[PDB]
Design a protein around this motif. Structure first.
Motif, PDB file in Angstrom:
ATOM      1  N   UNK A 103      68.463  60.601  67.344  1.00 39.60           N
ATOM      2  CA  UNK A 103      67.414  59.850  68.024  1.00 39.60           C
ATOM      3  C   UNK A 103      66.111  60.640  68.082  1.00 39.60           C
ATOM      4  N   UNK A 104      66.199  61.957  68.231  1.00 40.34           N
ATOM      5  CA  UNK A 104      65.016  62.776  68.423  1.00 40.34           C
ATOM      6  C   UNK A 104      64.393  63.280  67.137  1.00 40.34           C
ATOM      7  N   UNK A 105      64.548  62.518  66.056  1.00 38.84           N
ATOM      8  CA  UNK A 105      64.086  62.901  64.730  1.00 38.84           C
ATOM      9  C   UNK A 105      63.211  61.795  64.162  1.00 38.84           C
TER      10      UNK A 105
ATOM     11  N   UNK B 196      61.038  65.715  66.984  1.00 34.29           N
ATOM     12  CA  UNK B 196      60.051  65.628  68.052  1.00 34.29           C
ATOM     13  C   UNK B 196      60.657  65.868  69.427  1.00 34.29           C
ATOM     14  N   UNK B 197      61.980  65.741  69.566  1.00 28.63           N
ATOM     15  CA  UNK B 197      62.609  65.916  70.871  1.00 28.63           C
ATOM     16  C   UNK B 197      62.444  67.331  71.411  1.00 28.63           C
ATOM     17  N   UNK B 198      62.191  68.315  70.544  1.00 27.58           N
ATOM     18  CA  UNK B 198      61.957  69.678  71.016  1.00 27.58           C
ATOM     19  C   UNK B 198      60.794  69.732  71.996  1.00 27.58           C
TER      20      UNK B 198
ATOM     21  N   UNK C  13      49.452  70.369  72.354  1.00 30.70           N
ATOM     22  CA  UNK C  13      48.789  70.568  71.068  1.00 30.70           C
ATOM     23  C   UNK C  13      49.786  70.927  69.974  1.00 30.70           C
ATOM     24  N   UNK C  14      50.898  71.572  70.330  1.00 34.19           N
ATOM     25  CA  UNK C  14      51.943  71.812  69.346  1.00 34.19           C
ATOM     26  C   UNK C  14      52.583  70.524  68.861  1.00 34.19           C
ATOM     27  N   UNK C  15      52.744  69.554  69.762  1.00 32.52           N
ATOM     28  CA  UNK C  15      53.270  68.247  69.377  1.00 32.52           C
ATOM     29  C   UNK C  15      52.306  67.519  68.445  1.00 32.52           C
ATOM     30  N   UNK C  16      51.017  67.512  68.785  1.00 35.94           N
ATOM     31  CA  UNK C  16      50.026  66.892  67.911  1.00 35.94           C
ATOM     32  C   UNK C  16      50.055  67.542  66.534  1.00 35.94           C
ATOM     33  N   UNK C  17      50.116  68.874  66.491  1.00 33.00           N
ATOM     34  CA  UNK C  17      50.192  69.559  65.213  1.00 33.00           C
ATOM     35  C   UNK C  17      51.432  69.197  64.419  1.00 33.00           C
TER      36      UNK C  17
END
Ligand SMILES: CC(C)CCC[C@@H](C)CCC[C@@H](C)CCC[C@@H](C)CCOC[C@@H](CO)OCC[C@H](C)CCC[C@H](C)CCC[C@H](C)CCCC(C)C
Ligand SMILES: CC(C)CCC[C@@H](C)CCC[C@@H](C)CCC[C@@H](C)CCOC[C@@H](CO)OCC[C@H](C)CCC[C@H](C)CCC[C@H](C)CCCC(C)C
Ligand SMILES: CC(C)CCC[C@@H](C)CCC[C@@H](C)CCC[C@@H](C)CCOC[C@@H](CO)OCC[C@H](C)CCC[C@H](C)CCC[C@H](C)CCCC(C)C
Ligand SMILES: CC(C)CCC[C@@H](C)CCC[C@@H](C)CCC[C@@H](C)CCOC[C@@H](CO)OCC[C@H](C)CCC[C@H](C)CCC[C@H](C)CCCC(C)C
Ligand SMILES: CC(C)CCC[C@@H](C)CCC[C@@H](C)CCC[C@@H](C)CCOC[C@@H](CO)OCC[C@H](C)CCC[C@H](C)CCC[C@H](C)CCCC(C)C
Ligand SMILES: CC(C)CCC[C@@H](C)CCC[C@@H](C)CCC[C@@H](C)CCOC[C@@H](CO)OCC[C@H](C)CCC[C@H](C)CCC[C@H](C)CCCC(C)C
Ligand SMILES: *C/C=C(C)/C=C/C=C(C)/C=C/C1=C(C)CCCC1(C)C
Ligand SMILES: *C/C=C(C)/C=C/C=C(C)/C=C/C1=C(C)CCCC1(C)C
Ligand SMILES: *C/C=C(C)/C=C/C=C(C)/C=C/C1=C(C)CCCC1(C)C
Ligand SMILES: CCCCCCCCCCCCCCC
Ligand SMILES: CCCCCCCCCCCCCCC
Ligand SMILES: CCCCCCCCCCCCCCC
Ligand SMILES: CCCCCCCCCCCCCCC
Ligand SMILES: CCCCCCCCCCCCCCC
Ligand SMILES: CCCCCCCCCCCCCCC
Ligand SMILES: CCCCCCCCCCCCCC
Ligand SMILES: CCCCCCCCCCCCCC
Ligand SMILES: CCCCCCCCCCCCC
Ligand SMILES: CCCCCCCCCCCCC
Ligand SMILES: CCCCCCCCCCCCC
Ligand SMILES: CCCCCCCCCCC
Ligand SMILES: CCCCCCCCCCC
Ligand SMILES: CCCCCCCCCCC
Ligand SMILES: CCCCCCCCCC
Ligand SMILES: CCCCCCCCCC
Ligand SMILES: CCCCCCCCCC
Ligand SMILES: CCCCCCCCC
Ligand SMILES: CCCCCCCCC
Ligand SMILES: CCCCCCCCC
Ligand SMILES: CCCCCCCC
Ligand SMILES: CCCCCCCC
Ligand SMILES: CCCCCCCC
Ligand SMILES: CCCCCCCC
Ligand SMILES: CCCCCCCC
Ligand SMILES: CCCCCCCC
Ligand SMILES: CCCCCCCC
Lengths: 231, 231, 231
Positions: free
Chosen positions: B61-63, B77-79, B118-122
């Motif tokens: 799910x988190x992919x 993205x779940x990280x 910002x790590x998520x946006x990247x």
């Protein structure tokens, strides 16, 4: 709107949450006690948030389609955006009533976030059997919350003023009974086994939501437990 | 599940976070000191959150897939949903240990949110070169956090009880070493330059996560620094 | 980037928020008063968050297309992610200045979340006429905030030190004038009636954002109201 049979229950829910918000807002006008102001602010925000999310469901914004069981299933995701914010506010009402310690408040709010977050994942999961794995994790988080409300808060309320002890005991009982129904409706409704159709499921959640928010608030804000002991 | 070579490390991570959660939960049963209850609540929530997000990655799910470099790249993205909540909780453990002032706590939590956001946006950016602009901003936010932990908290711990000073110094050193590895793994892994393959990248994050959460928690909750000075 | 005529205003906004962040960060280095540290932390985070969201709009990440009026309309959704966090921080600056009670702070932050949340829903709504239903709900939430800032805080500031009363009065007036312009720009801009084109709309929001964040911060952090009364 009217193309969905459940629209009547979404419209009723919207109206009752809006009316509840306005009543609490007016009733709280003539309050200066700083303790009472806390409870009015928490308790008025709860139906105001729910009002906006019921409206989003009525207008069709808070609805998505999730494929599972070889079918596109209508899932009202706006419920979880509502619950994510309103369920911790309701627990804060109870915790402040008994003057709970900070560590216990954080444990309650954190478990509540896990409960709602995993329920949302379960609602959007496309592998049918995995939906119930998330339901079970979420239900375990709820049981932790209910345990704390009984075997941590109850003992704390008895050492408090009599009116705060009796008011807490009533709101505790209301909460445990109403909250426990939610995982059952989910399991037998369209998110889970699909035994109960969506329009009936929507009616049940509306009765539970109004009772757990407006009914809860009417009991709390009519009590003298929310005011400090003053001469 | 098993169609992805990294599944073994996601399954191990899930198990170790779950076991860590249960140990902390049981160990915290026999605790009544209100100060100790704070640290147990914060420290138990950390692996409980991580457990749910590792499970979401294991079950798929988190992919998501992000196109860049002319390729559909698997991005977990779940990280970031994990880190968004667990990294500020870990900083709160440290800040409460040294009785940090409110303004400093808010600066730490805010910089941490910028770091993760910002790590998520990247991670989701489709223009390859821009991914590293976000990496640099996020790394600057981390360096601010590390500066505060050294040139703001360390001096505060020395004026505290000896056991809280020595415990903080150990947890500070563990945190600075482990957290600094994360931007490096990101840069050389599948989110960045793609030098290290995803299955090895997943193993590295699992070792770091378990050490930074469960290992961190074992050191803290075995210390007497979490209890108030009592007779 | 340069393919969008509004890019020049996004680039200017990014630069001014970044410069504002650095100035506040440097100015706050030589501060040890725990009260002053609170205001510096809150006030420095505001333009730092806005910097990241302006950059995301400049690089094209914070932009989506929403169909309504038979057209794919460019909607910069990153504005609401900015405002969701920066508007409550700005209200906290004001509330701490007057030592507002907790219940009032929670009411302000909750109404502010409803204001931004319903504005986001309105921006992403595909049924044209419904966009203005959400605009009206959001505007009602703003009017509640403005009422509290006038008929709850003003009376509280007068019973405070003279310098905190005069500083609050100035920041109150700045806030009410600038915040009131936002719903107007939305209504006549590309999110609403479409009278003003997007490039002009972007210029207006940039002037408002910089004034409401950097200009606001320069007035606050130059005041002696942020320091405790000391010998
Ligand atoms: C001070 O403490 C008391 C204020 O608490 C009570 C203050 C409230 C918590 C403030 C939140 C309510 C806002 C005023 C939001 C207004 C929009 C509402 C959703 C209106 C809904 C009812 C109507 C539109 C039918
Ligand atoms: C202390 C307590 C408060 C702790 C809280 C407990 C909490 C950790 C419990 C788990 C929460 C976690 C499951 C939340 C998941 C949100 C997610 C459903 C949002 C929608 O994204 C899901 C998929 C589409 O189905 O995205 C499709 C792919 C997209 C590209 C996804 C990219 C966006 C990511 C969702 C970014 C992460 C944002 C955070 C999850 C925001 C918080 C949401 C809220 C529900 C917690
Ligand atoms: C009072 O302060 C002590 C409580 O802190 C400790 C309380 C914890 C912070 C409460 C959070 C744990 C919840 C009980 C969540 C239960 C679901 C867990 C994810 C279970 C994971 C382990 C198992 C399923 C393998
Ligand atoms: C004090 C501190 C806590 C401050 C925190 C610092 C913080 C400001 C730093 C920046 C955070 C910001 C980058 C968060 C972005 C979340 C975003 C990735 C969610 C997924 O949306 C991204 C795109 C698809 O790639 O959406 C596709 C288009 C969709 C239509 C998007 C519409 C939904 C918007 C995402 C709504 C905004 C919601 C908030 C960002 C929720 C908070 C998420 C969390 C990650 C901060
Ligand atoms: C202690 O209280 C004072 C610290 O407050 C002030 C501390 C700040 C609130 C910390 C937040 C700033 C972080 C250091 C983030 C760094 C990245 C910034 C977005 C950099 C932007 C400016 C430059 C890149 C142009
Ligand atoms: C005390 C105060 C802080 C209270 C706050 C007031 C608040 C309740 C006011 C209402 C907020 C509510 C409207 C937030 C909606 C966020 C939503 C726009 C995110 C994007 O999703 C919208 C649609 C695509 O258009 O998703 C397409 C369908 C997807 C499958 C959606 C699945 C993911 C859901 C969005 C999960 C819910 C996550 C929470 C809304 C995260 C918080 C976001 C933030 C904007 C409040
Ligand atoms: C006002 C709304 C309230 C009080 C909602 C409460 C909701 C719950 C207690 C939901 C619980 C759930 C589970 C325990 C697992 C199944 C999914 C949920 C989220 C319905
Ligand atoms: C339990 C998890 C922890 C302690 C995670 C920590 C993660 C970081 C410190 C991540 C840092 C990053 C950067 C500095 C930039 C590159 C992207 C990140 C988010 C990996
Ligand atoms: C730094 C940014 C600030 C202070 C932004 C303030 C934004 C508002 C006060 C927005 C208000 C809105 C409404 C009242 C309804 C229309 C939609 C909004 C969100 C623009
Ligand atoms: C916790 C409450 C769950 C009880 C659900 C009762 C539902 C009864 C309604 C009739 C079921 C409809 C099936 C035939 C359409
Ligand atoms: C004097 C007490 C009643 C005031 C009127 C309250 C109107 C709000 C709607 C309440 C209906 C739901 C009550 C819970 C069942
Ligand atoms: C901070 C830790 C980063 C060190 C990364 C070491 C990775 C070594 C593994 C071998 C690399 C695999 C490349 C060939 C497939
Ligand atoms: C008595 C201390 C050990 C208790 C057992 C802890 C089991 C949880 C898993 C810990 C493994 C990871 C430790 C960090 C390397
Ligand atoms: C609260 C400020 C709103 C005032 C908006 C003034 C806009 C004037 C710019 C000219 C309008 C452009 C229309 C012709 C392209
Ligand atoms: C000595 C006071 C001025 C310091 C320089 C501040 C530079 C930051 C940019 C401010 C421009 C926007 C001001 C509000 C109009
Ligand atoms: C964006 C999510 C940030 C919230 C993380 C949850 C932990 C918050 C800790 C707050 C510390 C207390 C500050 C005064
Ligand atoms: C939905 C996001 C709201 C959180 C914004 C971050 C600032 C919160 C300020 C909290 C003020 C303290 C209340 C007691
Ligand atoms: C285990 C704590 C005792 C109080 C909790 C009552 C449990 C109610 C069962 C709810 C059923 C949900 C499926
Ligand atoms: C600048 C503050 C001093 C302590 C921080 C140590 C920096 C470690 C470098 C991390 C490398 C990340 C790329
Ligand atoms: C009703 C509270 C008095 C102070 C609020 C001033 C109202 C300004 C109007 C803003 C217009 C937005 C459309
Ligand atoms: C298609 C039904 C599969 C049954 C899975 C039930 C999982 C429940 C887990 C509770 C421990
Ligand atoms: C495709 C590689 C482009 C290099 C961009 C590096 C940006 C790093 C910024 C750090 C200041
Ligand atoms: C297409 C225009 C439809 C007009 C709707 C206006 C709604 C405003 C509600 C304010 C009470
Ligand atoms: C104050 C009354 C609010 C009722 C409006 C919502 C009901 C939906 C009617 C279609
Ligand atoms: C308490 C043990 C938890 C282990 C379950 C998660 C491991 C995944 C096995 C496939
Ligand atoms: C400190 C100066 C920051 C300026 C960088 C952002 C401006 C965009 C230029 C294209
Ligand atoms: C759970 C039922 C709530 C009943 C609300 C009526 C309260 C009136 C004081
Ligand atoms: C970073 C390594 C942590 C080691 C955990 C063992 C702690 C036992 C007291
Ligand atoms: C709203 C205009 C703000 C003006 C900023 C200048 C402040 C200098 C002290
Ligand atoms: C002693 C108070 C009983 C409250 C229980 C109400 C259940 C809906
Ligand atoms: C403590 C009583 C639990 C009642 C459960 C009702 C579920 C429908
Ligand atoms: C003096 C304590 C040393 C701790 C460093 C551990 C690095 C993993
Ligand atoms: C303070 C020591 C930093 C160690 C960095 C290790 C990065 C892999
Ligand atoms: C932008 C850097 C500011 C230079 C110092 C200003 C005086 C404290
Ligand atoms: C008495 C202070 C006046 C401030 C108003 C400024 C309006 C932009
Ligand atoms: C209190 C003065 C309100 C000014 C409104 C300006 C809107 C553009």
């Amino acid at each position: 709107i009217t193309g969905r049979p459940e629209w009547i229950w979404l419209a009723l829910g919207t109206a009752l949450m809006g009316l509840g918000t306005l009543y609490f807002l007016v009733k709280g006008m003539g309050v200066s006690d700083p303790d009472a102001k806390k409870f009015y602010a928490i308790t008025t925000l709860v139906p105001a948030i729910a009002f906006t999310m019921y409206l989003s469901m009525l207008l069709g914004y808070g609805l998505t389609m999730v494929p599972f069981g070889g079918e596109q299933n209508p899932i009202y995701w706006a419920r979880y955006a509502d619950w994510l914010f309103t369920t911790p506010l309701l627990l804060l009402d109870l915790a402040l009533l008994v003057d709970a310690d900070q560590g216990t408040i954080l444990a309650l709010v954190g478990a509540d976030g896990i409960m709602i977050g995993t329920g949302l994942v379960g609602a959007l999961t496309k592998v049918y059997s995995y939906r119930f794995v998330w339901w079970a994790i979420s239900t375990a988080a709820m049981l932790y919350i209910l345990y704390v409300l009984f075997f941590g808060f109850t003992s704390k309320a008895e050492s408090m003023r009599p009116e705060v002890a009796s008011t807490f005991k009533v709101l505790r009982n209301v909460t445990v009974v109403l909250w426990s129904a939610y995982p059952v409706v989910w399991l037998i409704g369209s998110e889970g086994a699909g035994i109960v159709p969506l329009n009936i499921e929507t009616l049940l959640f509306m009765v539970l939501d109004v009772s757990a928010k407006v009914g809860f608030g009417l009991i709390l804000l009519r009590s003298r437990a929310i005011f400090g002991e003053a001469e």
